[PDB]
Amino acid sequence: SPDFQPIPSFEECFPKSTKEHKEVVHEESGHVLKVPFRRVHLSGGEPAFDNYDTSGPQNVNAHIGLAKLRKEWIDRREKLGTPRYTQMYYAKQGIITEEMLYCATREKLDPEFVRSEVARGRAIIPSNKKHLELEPMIVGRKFLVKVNANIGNSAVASSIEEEVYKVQWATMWGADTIMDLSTGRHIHETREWILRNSAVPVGTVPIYQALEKVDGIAENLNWEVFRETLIEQAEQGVDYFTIHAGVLLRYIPLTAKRLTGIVSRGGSIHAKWCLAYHKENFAYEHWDDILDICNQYDVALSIGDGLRPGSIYDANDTAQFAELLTQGELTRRAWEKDVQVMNEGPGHVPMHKIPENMQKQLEWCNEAPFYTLGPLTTDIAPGYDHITSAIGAANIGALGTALLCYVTPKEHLGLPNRDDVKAGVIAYKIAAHAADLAKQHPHAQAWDDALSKARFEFRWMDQFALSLDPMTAMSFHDETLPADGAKVAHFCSMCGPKFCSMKITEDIRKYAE
Amino acid sequence: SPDFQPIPSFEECFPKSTKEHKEVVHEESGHVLKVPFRRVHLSGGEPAFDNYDTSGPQNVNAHIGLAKLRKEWIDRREKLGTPRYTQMYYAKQGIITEEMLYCATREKLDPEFVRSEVARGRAIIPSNKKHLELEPMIVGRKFLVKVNANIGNSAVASSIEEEVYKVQWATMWGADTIMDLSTGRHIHETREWILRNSAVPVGTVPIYQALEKVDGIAENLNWEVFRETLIEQAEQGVDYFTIHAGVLLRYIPLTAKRLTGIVSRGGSIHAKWCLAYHKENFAYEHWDDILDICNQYDVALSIGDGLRPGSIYDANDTAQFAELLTQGELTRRAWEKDVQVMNEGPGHVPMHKIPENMQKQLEWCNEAPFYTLGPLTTDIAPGYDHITSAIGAANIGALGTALLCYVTPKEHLGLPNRDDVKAGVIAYKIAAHAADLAKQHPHAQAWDDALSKARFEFRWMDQFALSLDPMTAMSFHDETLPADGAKVAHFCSMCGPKFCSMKITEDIRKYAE
Ligand SMILES: Nc1ncnc2c1ncn2[C@@H]1O[C@H](CSCC[C@H](N)C(=O)O)[C@@H](O)[C@H]1O
Ligand SMILES: Nc1ncnc2c1ncn2[C@@H]1O[C@H](CSCC[C@H](N)C(=O)O)[C@@H](O)[C@H]1O
Ligand SMILES: O=P(O)(O)OC[C@H]1O[C@@H](n2ccnc2)[C@H](O)[C@@H]1O
Ligand SMILES: O=P(O)(O)OC[C@H]1O[C@@H](n2ccnc2)[C@H](O)[C@@H]1O
Ligand code: SF4
Ligand code: SF4
Ligand SMILES: [Cl-]
Ligand SMILES: [Cl-]
Ligand SMILES: [Zn+2]
Ligand SMILES: [Zn+2]
């Protein structure tokens, strides 16, 4: 029994907000779905503003875990009987599942549209039938751009208590998925506590634990070890697996002249094994067997980019695109077995090289959802790689990337702590939303408009309440003007009362009456 | 005599770096120029890495001020005699000045190319002949993307001591220009201390002090008051003036349906005056008289964007582009009198609307340098507008914007302090450099490559030394691994020794021998 400690409350993080749920009925089953959202309560006759909410159920004892909200859905489908358990299988049969309706409601889009996007491979709903605690969400270019937060220990740092805190904290600030990338002690146990306490999808990179199972000797990996690890993780409820099946033996020499070589953790492990034996990647060789596992649980496959560029110098090189071509082949093969797929992308990429990345992925991978690590647009600022990569992530998101893997201020430096997790999630929520606006995604600008209206009207508390991080905005304002009266003042300390342009506009318009 | 206190030393901010100067001779005059740069001293047989340096002369008593390095240049040109004193006038005569050669050396480009860019109006060298302390720099699309830091007091906050600290601090971290936007007490005096202690160009918005001269009553402004303010500021050495001469009477009603109205400080002041009298903007009316002042000192004109959008809702609206059209007219008129010009741009602009901004400016303003405030790509994150705008600034910089006005974490909330100044400069140096890479600017990637080589080779101290903010990178790494031995370890706490991909690549390549 770990010594779990609670994260700050929803109310402390989001003053004037309440957690709400929209109730809808899944017509085929009669199941009632409670789809979460938040409501920001405003002043001055403004209607309350409703926003997305990933924070999940609050104040739940981590020793007990979250309610198993999906239980009746899974039980009913098992009793009906089915050859495959994936959302893509159901979508292709013409079935709108509870998960699809839940996502449609959450996205304010039609359930049939969700079904269509899943059936055609252009969106995924990562939702292992063993992750009963999950509040379903959808990843795809036609939907809100989503953010992943990476957490997990290393052999050098952290603990079970701290990782559970970090999952709850990441989702509080807007993480849409998390991955447990633990490479230290207690891998299985850490992940069990996380899954039972995570309302968002949980991904892993199974080769990390496989390498642990063989005591860090990559040469002792093989398909059988890996297969056992896949089953173990699937049984716990992992919703998606990153698998570097595109790191082919013949692609490894393409990296010999790179400045930063192979920077992918899983990719480097596969490359070492391949070179040791001069054999083809065992995950590639056994792709069909991996698909058979995924079909029984609905584990989505996130096809890794083990040959992603780790420096600006290496961006968009032959190695990177050789792997992308193979990811497309693997994607099409997975779809033949109705397995949900997304593709992992770069990396360190300068801005002028970003469009080529999207163009090639959309074509070669038949519009499967893309999932990028940034990209970082420059190598010059370790300590600020949440900013160097927010630029790339926003750009590639605007071009169609569906899931943005965050990058924290600790990238290239060390394991992120709870503060770094928050900073990364905030930076990535900015990038994702900026991308939603650039895509003219329906109703995305309503958020900006509500905050800007509060800004123009000097409804300061409303402005703070509507923001991504209300207490930061409020505290920053109060550093110079802390008095209650200033929360209704028609200026702040930047310009002062006589130089505030919005107050001058106010008088300008008043005189125009 | 203010109680000036020193900023942290160059050595504390940039370990392993030295300040250096490249000596070149201005052939026409025989004047010897000492053009600053920094040198980062590296290990492992790497050559030292030379980078740009805006920090200026160090450890100089602010009561005494910087050396008047340009004195002999100005004195010689006065003795030769000239009708106009601007770099554009000299460039059009076919003269390569000390300023042009200094900039060429600093940019590693040909002096004739600098002259050509200035003569054609596509670059400016803001360099008032009364700012003798200035180390010349150039702003233009063909050059490194530059960053401006805004400082100054308000009626509500700050002091002379703190503003001088902030100028030295901003330039330490990479600010290429600063503006003294003081709207409180001691405007003249604050600016005098800043100019005498600033090695970078100093800009102002003269209407702010003009409004102060009439006790905050905009209706008591007029050309004469404004003219007196221009002369006062020019005499001190201000290198450029933001003047909102494109805020025309007939454009003001175009803002009536805006969500956030007129958010420009100077623009709102001009609009109030125009509406009060139903008269044309006096700065527009007296444009020719402003040009006559600028020609005697070489003050560059930064044509304001008083109708810039202050919310995503207002982006790229009729008001904004009406003003842009007028900025082009004003630009061409200024060039007829050989006055150097840049144009100010937005603002709050979603990413998909950024290209239109650049396309219109390049055409309508005949490729004059563009100077943007961001743009902010979303309104949702006050407290993090250095990040929301770094995205926009990088994008618009990649498309050709020459000067990026920073935005600090205090934007929309209060007056930035010294910490916020650093944060804004860092974010903007990232955006500017990312833009340099996207433009494939010569030798820009050498910086990224040097840091990435140090990263791959586990030369940790070199990696930190090469970064934008060495002590942040070092401290962050040391939070988990503080021991000296870890500075040569082939891993960090993110992956640990057995999962470090670069170490695995290392072994992979070693085995390949
Ligand atoms: N335990 C953990 N917690 C948080 N992020 C992790 C993590 N383990 C791995 N990651 C993420 O996975 C990455 C792989 S290790 C280094 C990756 C390299 N910088 C690159 O460009 O790809 C880390 O940088 C981090 O982004
Ligand atoms: N004294 C000062 N110190 C630092 N920045 C200042 C400043 N005075 C003005 N500024 C800058 O000038 C801006 C004008 S006031 C508000 C501008 C508004 N947010 C907009 O979108 O245009 C400030 O937001 C800040 O960016
Ligand atoms: O094992 P590697 O380094 O490839 O993966 C590290 C992390 O990076 C994420 N990622 C995303 C895109 N490319 C990589 C991936 O999902 C996992 O979270
Ligand atoms: O008076 P206004 O608000 O226009 O200008 C505020 C600041 O913003 C800068 N700016 C840059 C582009 N548009 C505006 C301008 O140079 C000055 O630093
Ligand atoms: S004083 Fe300036 S920064 Fe503050 S609310 Fe008014 S316009 Fe915005
Ligand atoms: S351990 Fe991981 S994060 Fe640290 S240097 Fe190695 S690859 Fe980079
Ligand atoms: Cl690294
Ligand atoms: Cl504001
Ligand atoms: Zn990296
Ligand atoms: Zn603004």
Residue numbers in the entry:
A (entry chain A), B (entry chain A): 79 to 591
What's written in the study?
We prepared two different crystal forms of AtThiC, each containing the substrate analogue imidazole ribonucleotide (IRN) and the SAM analogue S-adenosylhomocysteine (SAH), which is also a competitive inhibitor of ThiC21. In the canonical radical SAM enzymes, the SAM amino and carboxylate groups anchor to the differentiated iron in the [4Fe-4S] cluster; however, in ThiC the fourth iron binds to a chloride ion, and the amino and carboxylate groups of SAH anchor to an additional transition metal site. In addition to the amino and carboxylate groups of SAH, the metal is coordinated to two absolutely conserved histidine residues (His426 and His490 in AtThiC and His417 and His481 in CcThiC) and two water molecules. For the crystals grown with addition of ZnSO4, strong fluorescence emission peaks were observed for both Fe and Zn, and a trace-level peak was observed for Ni. The higher level of Zn suggested a bound Zn with the probable site being the metal bound by His426 and His490. Peak heights for a metal at its absorption edge were 60–80 times the root mean square value of the map. The results of the multiwavelength anomalous diffraction experiments using the cluster iron atoms as a reference are shown in Supplementary Table 1 and indicate that in the absence of added ZnSO4 the metal is iron, and that when ZnSO4 is added during crystallization the iron is displaced by zinc. Zinc when added to AtThiC at a 1:1 molar ratio during crystallization largely displaces iron at the additional metal site. In the high-resolution crystal structures of AtThiC containing SAH, the average Fe…S distance from the iron covalently bound to Cys573 is 3.5 Å (range 3.3–3.7 Å) with an average Fe…S-C angle of 165° (range 162°–169°). The three crystal structures determined for AtThiC with bound IRN show that IRN adopts the same binding mode observed in the previously determined structure of CcThiC that lacked a [4Fe-4S] cluster.
ThiC, the enzyme discussed here, catalyses the complex rearrangement of aminoimidazole ribonucleotide (AIR) to 4-amino-5-hydroxymethyl-2-methylpyrimidine phosphate (HMP-P) in the thiamin biosynthetic pathways of bacteria and plants 17 and is an example of a non-canonical radical SAM enzyme. The CX2CX4C motif of ThiC varies from the canonical radical SAM motif and is located near the C terminus of the sequence. The homodimeric structure of Caulobacter crescentus ThiC (CcThiC) showed a (β/α)8-barrel fold and suggested that the cluster-binding domain, which was disordered, resides near the C terminus and inserts into the active site of an adjacent protomer through domain swapping. The cluster-binding domain inserts into the active site of an adjacent catalytic domain through domain swapping as previously predicted.
